[PDB]
Design a protein around this ligand. Structure first.
Ligand SMILES: [Cl-]
Ligand SMILES: [Cl-]
Ligand SMILES: [Mg+2]
Ligand SMILES: [Mg+2]
Lengths: 128, 128
């Protein structure tokens, strides 16, 4: 079973008041690897305020910080299961920020909690 | 819903050739918080070799580094579900190292991947 790694861009440039995407993908495809969770964190934030977005395969997204907050964040492509007919897909963890503010600038870390490989991460600087 | 934090000791002293435990507990009890995964990492290791142990609620433990490796690691108290009669318990992520070697010394990070709160961690220096 191959190791997995988090593919990101090192820097993304956004426009104030606009939307920007932070690509994040778990590579390569590894049959049998289970993605238990994905999170986005601001690693330079106070330690108890690092998590800004999370995604669970069965329960979907959460946004455990008021800023940027649910209203200004979306998982662009991640899918949760909503019934017997639908399966989760967390491999593309790309995050969008909406209504960009100056306080949104900085480092963002995309982390996949996987089994059996454990947790792996990649970091992007959002420049606004 | 209260934030959760990882409770650890800052330093644990082991004896060469012996067993040592690294306590790790997710606090406080939070009704509704789901623990998706726990991992133990060596944060000072090369980046692609940080994960040394993982625990999934349904699939149990994995040890994605040859050292210390499965033979020399155990989750002291974590429980997986093994059927309809049993439920997982990951809140106590305490790790034991066995047959301690000098190469085992250093920082160990215990991380819980939770929903909806995201991923939180605590770090302990194992002194041997
Ligand atoms: Cl590999
Ligand atoms: Cl709180
Ligand atoms: Mg928070
Ligand atoms: Mg490995």
């Amino acid at each position: 079973m191959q190791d997995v790694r988090v593919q990101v861009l090192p820097e993304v440039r956004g426009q104030l008041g606009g939307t920007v995407e932070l690509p994040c993908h778990l590579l390569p495809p590894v049959p049998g690897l289970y993605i238990s969770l994905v999170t986005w964190q601001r690693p330079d934030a106070p330690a108890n305020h690092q998590n800004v977005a999370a995604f669970h395969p069965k329960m979907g997204p959460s946004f455990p910080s008021p800023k940027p907050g649910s209203e200004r964040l979306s998982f662009v492509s991640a899918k949760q299961s909503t019934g017997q007919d639908t399966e989760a897909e967390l491999q593309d963890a790309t995050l969008a920020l909406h209504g960009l503010t100056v306080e949104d600038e900085g480092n963002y870390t995309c982390e996949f909690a996987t089994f059996p490989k454990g947790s792996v991460r990649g970091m992007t600087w959002l420049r606004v």
